Amino acid sequence: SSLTLVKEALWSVIDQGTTLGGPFFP
Amino acid sequence: ILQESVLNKYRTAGQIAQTALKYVTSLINDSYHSKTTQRQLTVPELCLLTDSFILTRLEQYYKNKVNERGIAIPTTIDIDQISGGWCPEIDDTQNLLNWNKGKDSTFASSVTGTLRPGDLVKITLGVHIDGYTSEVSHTMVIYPVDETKPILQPTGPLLGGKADAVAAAHIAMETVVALLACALTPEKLPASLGGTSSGITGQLIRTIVDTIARSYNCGVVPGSRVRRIRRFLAGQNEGIVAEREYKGVVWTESHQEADLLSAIPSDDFVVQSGEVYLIDLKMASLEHCTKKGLVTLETVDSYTGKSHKAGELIARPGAYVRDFAQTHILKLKTSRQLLTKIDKQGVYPFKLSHLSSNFPFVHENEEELQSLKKDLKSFRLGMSEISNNYLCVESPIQIARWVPWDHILKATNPNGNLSYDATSTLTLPGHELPLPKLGVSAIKLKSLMNSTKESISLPVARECNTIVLCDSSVSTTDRPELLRLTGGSKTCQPSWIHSQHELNPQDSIVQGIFQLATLAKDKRFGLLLKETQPMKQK
Amino acid sequence: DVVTREYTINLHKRLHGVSFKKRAPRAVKEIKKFAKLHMGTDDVRLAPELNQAIWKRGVKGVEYRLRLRISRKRNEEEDAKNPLFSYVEPVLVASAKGLQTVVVEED
Amino acid sequence: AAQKSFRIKQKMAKAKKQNRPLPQWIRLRTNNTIRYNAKRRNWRRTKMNI
Amino acid sequence: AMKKVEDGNILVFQVSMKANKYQIKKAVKELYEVDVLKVNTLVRPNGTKKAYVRLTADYDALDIANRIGYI
Amino acid sequence: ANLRTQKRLAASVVGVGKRKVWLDPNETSEIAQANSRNAIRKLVKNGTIVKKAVTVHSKSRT
Amino acid sequence: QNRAARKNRYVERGSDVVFGDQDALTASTENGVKLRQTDRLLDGVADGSMRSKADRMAKMERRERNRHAKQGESDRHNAVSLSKHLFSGKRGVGKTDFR
Amino acid sequence: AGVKAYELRTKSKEQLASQLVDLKKELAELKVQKLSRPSLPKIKTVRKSIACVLTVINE
RNA sequence: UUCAAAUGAGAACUUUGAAGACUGAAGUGGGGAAAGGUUCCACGUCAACAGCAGUUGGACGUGGGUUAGUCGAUCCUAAGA
Ligand SMILES: [Mg+2]
Ligand SMILES: [Mg+2]
Ligand SMILES: [Mg+2]
Ligand SMILES: [Mg+2]
Ligand SMILES: [Mg+2]
Ligand SMILES: [Mg+2]
Ligand SMILES: [Mg+2]
Secondary structure, three states: OHHHHHHHHHHHHHOOOEEEOOOOOO | OOOHHHHHHHHHHHHHHHHHHHHHHHHHHHHHHOOOOOOOOOHHHHHHHHHHHHHHHHOOOOOOOOOOEEEEEEEEEEEOOEEEOOOOOHHHHHHHHHHHOOOOOOOHHHHHOOOOOOOEEEEEEEEEEOOEEEEEEEEEEOOOEOOOOOOOOEOOOEEOHHHHHHHHHHHHHHHHHHHHHOOOOHHHOOOOOOOOOOOOEHHHHHHHHHHHHHHOOEEEOOOOEEEEEEOOEOOOOOOOOOOOOOOEEEOOHHHHHHHHHOOOOOOOOEOOOOOEEEEEEEEEEOOOOOOOEEEEEEEOOOOOOOOOOOOOOOOOOOEEEEOOOOOOOOOOHHHHHHHHHHHOOOOOOEEOHHHOOOOOOOOOOHHHHHHHHHHHHHHHHHHHHHHHOOOEEEOOOEEEEEEEHHHHHHOOOOOHHHOOEOOOOOHHHHOOOOEOOOOEOHHHHHHHHHHOOOOEEOOEEEEEEEEEEEOOOOOOOOOOEEEEOOOOOOOOOOOOEEEOOOOOOOOHHHHHHHHHHHHHHOOOOOOOEEEOOOOOOO | OOEEEEEEEEHHHHOOOOOHHHHHHHHHHHHHHHHHHHHOOOOEEEOHHHHHHHHOOOOOOOOOEEEEEEEEEEOOOOOOOOOEEEEEEEOOOOOOOOOOOEEOOOO | OOOOOHHHHHHHHHHHHHOOOOOHHHOOOOOOOOOOOOOOOOOOOOOOOO | OHHHHHHHOEEEEEEOOOOOHHHHHHHHHHHHOOOEEEEEEEEOOOOOEEEEEEEOOOOOHHHHHHHHOOO | OOOHHHHHHHHHHHOOOHHHEEEOOOOHHHHHHOOOHHHHHHHHHHOOEEEOOOOOOOOOOO | OHHHHHHOOOOOOHHHHHHOOOOOOOOOOOOOOOOOOOOOOOOOOOEHHHHHHHHHHHHHHOHHHHHOOOOOOOOOOOOOOOOOOOOOOOOOOOOOOOO | OOOOHHHHOOOOHHHHHHHHHHHHHHHHHHHHHHOOOOOOOHHHHHHHHHHHHHHHHHO
16 A cells, blocks of 8 residues: 555654854844 | 835835834833843834834925825844734733743743833834835844943853844845846846856745755744835735735745745846845745654744643734725724725735824824724724624735644645635635645645644844845936835944854855855946835934 | 527517507517518517517507617527527617618627 | 523523524545435524413 | 614613613623613514613713723 | 615615616716715716606696 | 835745645534534444435425425415405495405 | 633632633623624633632632 | 526526506405414525425525613503403
8 A cells, every 4th residue: 555655664764063143243 | 116206105105114123222222232221112112113113204304295194014023933913012911921821931022012121022014105015024033141241241242043033034135135226237147157148046045045044953933025015015914915016036845845946026136237126035044853854833822721731822913904805884883994904004914003093193192092992992992893704804814834744744634636725715815835746725725734743933133124126327426226215234234143054155056146246246347235224213 | 599680670660550569579470480581480589678678658559660680699508409599689879761671790 | 583582582582592604614534424404493483382 | 783873872782582771771881991871672583682871971971882892 | 787786775875765766878887887875876876877767657637 | 114024034844834725624514513513413322334324315305395395394374265355256236255 | 621620619708709800801802802803712611710719709 | 477687507487677457445445353473574494284386485494683751551530250
């Protein structure tokens, strides 16, 4: 079943950094 | 068709929108950050003052030369989980307190009207002249005030999922602006980003936005769009009013399902010169999600007896939309007068306070506010019969929600595709398939969201700009350039945030984003972006 | 073929011996049959002013002769089963006596 | 009659409230054997007899 | 019923069958803190009692409608 | 279309019988929109609905 | 007439642009009810698929009474097997029961 | 949800009277909302809370 | 009884207009008593019923509507109980 295949696929799939602004009020 | 008059009307609308955004930012900073003001303004007060400011600024422009003008998007202030539609009227403060007594403190900021530190305040407003609409929306952060410092500054930057959402929204906004400006110079497109001979595509827009959101661990709220704007067709009511032609890229639960498995909008278009684009992006934080789930929307009603949930928000929407295709003669004289006033507005969403003769106020007086409330009482009386005959509808209040995939997969729906909400007043959200491949309808999805015990809400950050792609003849300097009517470093300046996530430089899309940023910063042999400046007041 | 003519119809010999309650309806049906004979059209439409002229002197007071203007025109609707139809109009004249079939030039 | 007594009017009110077909959600219940309103009354078919 | 709010400053209520006009007036004045000009009553064909309560000129039925929540 | 209610309302508003009320056959949608006596009054004012005159009963021969 | 025609001009507006060819914008109810009007028949069934299933069930159930030509659920006229005034006849030389 | 009899029984007469009045006000508000929303499950628990408060007072 | 237009898949029968007639104030008009009990009115709508038809209906489905110190009951007594 296509629904079964879709559900199986979804089940198998689900199974420094950055700094903006500054010390002030814009 | 771009022209001198059309460009001037767009520029005037954008200038008024930028000035209103500056006005609201200054008001909020005075109320909660500088603390110079004695009385702290509330959300309905800020919205009403913004609408009056927009009307008073627009009154001087194109008088007796343009048939129709006014507020396109009513001033909306959304906090954290609220993703849109929050513009409460001044006569609903006690109603909100009475409705939400005995509830949790999760929506305490919105219920009381007073902002709190750490809140993400999303301010949205639009101005139209002769149907040419310019819209702005900016997320900002509310901070606690330092005491030891001589200068008013925040104690520290924003940390966590809210910071992730703000960073993702800002980076996506800037990158999409640069990418759309690259459409006027197709030879300046990076090779790793896309074809040198190929143009700008909705597929490229979607993959850039999804890459940024996945890098910052955020989801795209199902209201986000990057679309084309024409006269009287700006998507001011996208989920309410249907449109004959659409050109843009949208994000939905269907798109989330398709990406997981990897009138109708399609990402099979090429961005063309001489066009106006609206970019509205909402990023929902996924910090608290320890599983893989789906982002959806919950509609807020005014009924307290529908459930017993402690963390439920009860409110009444403040904006209405007139359906000019529906005609019915009313029985109340007050209702007929209100309908005449509503028809005098146009095809944009309106507030009941906008229809008062006192509004906008010339001098802000307590007696003026009392007269406005007195008018609002009879306006509610007329609106009850107007809405009872389907002449006007509500723009809904929506909250971002997270539903895990395992609950959806374990759920059973005996109807499948055939199910739909028959009690829905609106046609467009009533007949919807958010999960076409799983055959789960909107009513079934709402049932699953209410039944799940791990259905949480997600904070949302929003950024929305309007741009025009002016060609060589349209532009001032004989070379094509992008006129950003709303947004920029002057009005939409990012707040102090810090995130532990960043773009990963080992990816081709990330390299293309870096090249887009570099070419946007290059003003000589790169892209030309001209930002609209806010007009001075004093 | 679009065409327009004027005729005189002898309703006296067509209504000879007819019951009094049926004289005007039979005059209507005879006029329709007359137009069908002269134009080959199964679709005949009578003007309401022509109906007034038929019914002017009550149910049993139909005039002996009527002067009619019959126009064969084109049926513009796609759903119609016939491409042509006839439209019958009254010709209010001094008298319906001593008149011959004539062709009216359409401008 | 127009000038009626309260007992008559109360019985008329009860009959008016009883005058209805089945709710549709009754038909969806498990093991439901009720398929129509077998006690339905109309003003021109069966008289109430006071 | 909503027409009477703007037409005669009149609120329309469904009240108990055992209540008379004195009890209706006292209950309205107690519950909504408004002076009642007069009360008219009828028994509906469904067996419930309907009361047209007209307030005095000092008070507006529109305010009471907005307070109750139906408008 | 069905204008029975509108004809009855026009007769009541004008103050004559249904035999004395004329509805414009070209303004059918405009008449069908009129569900109230106020709208009927508007139609009478703008001429969509007209009051006919009485049938004469002359007394000259008498 | 030229002055009147030049005065009577039609200028499009935003309503004509947006809702010129569109219609509806609101789901039409099955019983033609208003927004806050109760629907006795359909308020207990939220979704239109189950509404259609219930409608089909009622229509299939109606068929026998339709064949019996009842005016409705309330038409429950009962006929006797035999009428005594029709089957109690011994007519002598005298008074009869009918003409 | 709703009130609990053993929690009600630890209170005084005036507290129970105030709770009953508040429950009656909430019931009136719910009956106002019911005119627009035909399905309102909170009405049942408010009614049962009123009945329980009356039961404890009478006891 | 007739003509035209509209609605509709479908019009002898629905709607509007145009005509011809009738009840002829002891009416086919306008109100009531007894009786009926929502049949009143709006919206939706055609399976069954309207011994033809039907887009129409006193039919079917959902609702709205009956406001009194002065109109009646309520009070009085009659033949009577
Ligand atoms: Mg003979
Ligand atoms: Mg009374
Ligand atoms: Mg006679
Ligand atoms: Mg006569
Ligand atoms: Mg038949
Ligand atoms: Mg009727
Ligand atoms: Mg009925």
